[PDB]
Amino acid sequence: LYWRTTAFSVWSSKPVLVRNIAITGVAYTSECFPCKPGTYAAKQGSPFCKLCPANYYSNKGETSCHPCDADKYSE
Amino acid sequence: LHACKESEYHFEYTACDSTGSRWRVAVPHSPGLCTSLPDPVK
Amino acid sequence: ELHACKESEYHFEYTACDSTGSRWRVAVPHSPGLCTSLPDPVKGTECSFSCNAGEFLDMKDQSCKPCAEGRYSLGTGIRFDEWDELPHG
Numbered sequence: 001l002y003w004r005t006t007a008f009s010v011w012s013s014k015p016v017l018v019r020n021i022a023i024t025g026v027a028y029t030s031e032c033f034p035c036k037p038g039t040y041a042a043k044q045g046s047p048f049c050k051l052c053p054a055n056y057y058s059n060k061g062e063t064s065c066h067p068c069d070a071d072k073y074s075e
Numbered sequence: 076l077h078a079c080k081e082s083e084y085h086f087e088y089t090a091c092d093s094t095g096s097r098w099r100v101a102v103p104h105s106p107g108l109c110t111s112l113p114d115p116v117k
Numbered sequence: 118e119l120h121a122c123k124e125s126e127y128h129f130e131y132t133a134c135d136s137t138g139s140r141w142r143v144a145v146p147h148s149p150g151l152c153t154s155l156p157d158p159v160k161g162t163e164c165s166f167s168c169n170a171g172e173f174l175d176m177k178d179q180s181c182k183p184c185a186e187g188r189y190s191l192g193t194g195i196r197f198d199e200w201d202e203l204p205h206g
């Protein structure tokens with residue numbers, strides 16, 4: 001795979017931004033992984049761990065995001 | 076079951092095998108209290 | 118970064134018996150650094166579980182299984198039926 005960007009020198013730009021590159025069909029079967037910190041999964045079979053809502057926090061392997069303290073904030 | 080910090084766990088040793096190797100496992104001070112315990116090491 | 122090992126990579130093992138006699142059925146990987154998120158430790162048997170003759174201790178559920186066909190266990194003992202040479206001990 002190639003990603004290439006050439007900018008024309010028009011004396012002016014905002015760079016191209018790329019995220020979430022997902023390539024399927026590699027290495028046949030793969031194994032399950034614990035959810036990353038700050039992410040939660042509710043039911044089995046999740047292809048991705050949903051992000052915990054703001055003002056809430058969580059850790060690895062959690063099935064739910066614990067509520068946070070009153071004197072604390074969390075993106 | 077919320078994740079446990081350094082306080083609620085003690086580190087205990089498994090049973091000695093034939094070759095003489097043990098595993099340092101981490102045990103909740105009282106049963107059923109947390110997950111994501113530190114990985115056992117030789 | 119590490120895996121979430123299935124039933125094939127984590128094995129149950131008993132901790133060292135304490136003074137009171139309590140053991141924890143901790144889950145241990147077969148080789149170090151291969152997986153995380155191991156099953157939580159649970160209470161083991163009180164350092165005196167002795168399976169009868171013809172049975173072996175199953176770690177998944179702490180009970181004496183009746184073994185398989187064509188195989189013997191000898192129970193919590195030993196036998197010295199062979200005498201070609203002097204047996205060890």
Ligand SMILES: [Cu+2]
Pocket residue numbers: 064065066067
């Ligand atoms: Cu909670």
Ligand SMILES: [Cu+2]
Pocket residue numbers: 125126127128146147148
């Ligand atoms: Cu193994």
